[PDB]
Structures are given as C-alpha cells and as structure tokens.
Amino acid sequence: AMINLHIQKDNPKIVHAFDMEDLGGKAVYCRCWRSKKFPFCDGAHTKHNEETGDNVGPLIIKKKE
Amino acid sequence: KAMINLHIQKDNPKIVHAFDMEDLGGKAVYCRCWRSKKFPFCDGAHTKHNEETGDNVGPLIIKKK
Numbered sequence A: 001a002m003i004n005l006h007i008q009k010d011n012p013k014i015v016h017a018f019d020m021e022d023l024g025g026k027a028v029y030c031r032c033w034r035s036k037k038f039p040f041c042d043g044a045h046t047k048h049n050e051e052t053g054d055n056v057g058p059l060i061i062k063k064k065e
Numbered sequence B: 001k002a003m004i005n006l007h008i009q010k011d012n013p014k015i016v017h018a019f020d021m022e023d024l025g026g027k028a029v030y031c032r033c034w035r036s037k038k039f040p041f042c043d044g045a046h047t048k049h050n051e052e053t054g055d056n057v058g059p060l061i062i063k064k065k
C-alpha cells in the first residue's frame, strides 16, 4: 500500500529542498501527503488519523527566538 | 482505510517533531515515508518502499545557503 495517493504522480520520487532562509520564522511540513498546501502542513493529518487510526504529525522547523 | 506509519512510536497519539534551525547544522534530510530506522531523519528506506508499493515519496532537505 502507497503512502502518497494524489501528489505529482508523474514524478518517480518527490523531494523538496529548501534553504533555511526560505522558512522565515517557522515552517510546518506535512509528513502525511494529505495536505492541500504540500509540502506544508494544513492540518489534514487530523482527518487521516481519525479515519485510519494512524498517529502521524507534521515536522516543525523554527528560529530559536 | 490503511495507515501511513506502521511501527514508529505507536504509543504516541500524534508524532510531531519540532527543531530549531541551529539543531540542523549545515543540512538535515527528513523522512516523509515513516520507514526510516533513524526517524525523523531519512536513511534511504523510501527507495525500498517506492520499489515495493509503486509509490513516489521522498525526503525533505533543509540546508544552509
């Protein structure tokens, strides 16, 4: 069973590379591949966890202050 | 129907990782397939997942400019 079901299925390996300056003060990244704002988290993991019984959540990268 | 995460910290109801940009050093490669033995970091387990399921998931790279 696949993890990603709809994102850029013409791409054989979806990879996102960012410079830390592109994150600003905080970036919240999607790790469930259900977000409408992918690679960013939009809270779609909540609906996925409720329907499948999963426990996935996002990745948060922020500035120290 | 089926879950994304199968074995990582199943006692945790929502797996979230939060880092300061200083904790990344020069480059961090984050897992988005939940198959890595070094989770939240990518160990290349996505290649085996993509080969077996026909998926196209890949990691998230955050680096210094």
Ligand code: FES
Residues within 6 Å of the ligand: A029, A030, A031, A032, A033, A034, A035, A040, A041, A042, A043, A044, A045, A046, A056, A057, A058, A059
């Ligand atoms: S929407 Fe995918 S982890 Fe939040």
Ligand code: FES
Residues within 6 Å of the ligand: B030, B031, B032, B033, B034, B035, B036, B041, B042, B043, B044, B045, B046, B047, B057, B058, B059, B060
């Ligand atoms: S091991 Fe999960 S994306 Fe590389």
